[PDB]
């Protein structure tokens, strides 16, 4: 399983992650992204998370495997 | 790039990780594993880190992608 993280101190609210993967990322009341789900096992969702991580212009997103 | 982590509270010093991947894991003075390197970009090393993560009998190891 994978767990996504959005560094709130890095994120500038570009939102391309939420664009690419709205099932995994949502905007919060500070205009930053955060994960909508606390675990991913679905391969398709994992793949769009990785796409979002690769696209963030400020490198705010990380993904952990266990 | 990837970063390994070994939860010191979880690890019981089984050491199969160090067996499978001695370039990535070493034993420390408390009898627990820890990462020898702070970053992996080599695919071979990543692969044997993932093998070690899948083999740990107590699930002490995790790997983060950025
Ligand atoms: S700036 Fe923030 S809103 Fe998404 S694309 Fe990067 S984590
Ligand atoms: S118990 Fe510890 S020594 Fe390695 S195989 Fe698991 S992290």
Residue with tokens 């894991």: B25
C-alpha A9/C-alpha A60 separation (Å) is 8
Q: Is the CB of B6 under 6 A from ligand 2?
A: yes
Q: Is the C-beta atom of A63 inside 6 A of ligand 1? A: no
| Structure tokens given for A49 | 């998370």
Q: Do the Cβ atoms of B39 and B2 come closer than 8 Å?
A: yes
8 A C-beta contact, residue B45 and residue B23? yes
E strands, B1-66, in order:
2-6, 25-27, 33-35, 61-65
First to last CA, chain A: 6
How many other C-beta atoms lie within 10 A of the C-beta of residue B2? 20
Compute CA distances A18 → A23, A32, B49, whole Å.
8, 10, 31
The two structure tokens encoding residue B9 = 């509270």
User: Which H helix or E strand runs over A65?
Assistant: strand A61-65
Phi, psi of A11 (to 5 degrees): -55, 135
Resolution of the PDB structure in angstroms: 1.5
Interface contact B66-A53, CB threshold 8 A: yes
The architecture that CATH gives domain B1-66 is: 2-Layer Sandwich (3.30)
d(CA B15, CA B12): 8
Q: Report how far Cα B60 is from the mean position of its chain's Cα atoms.
A: 8
């Amino acid at each position: 399983a994978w767990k996504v993280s959005v560094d709130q101190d890095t994120c500038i609210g570009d939102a391309i992650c939420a664009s690419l993967c709205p099932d995994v990322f949502e905007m919060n009341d500070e205009g930053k992204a955060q994960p909508k789900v606390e675990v991913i096992e679905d391969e398709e969702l994992y793949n769009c998370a990785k796409e979002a991580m690769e696209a963030c212009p400020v490198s705010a997103i990380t993904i952990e495997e266990a």
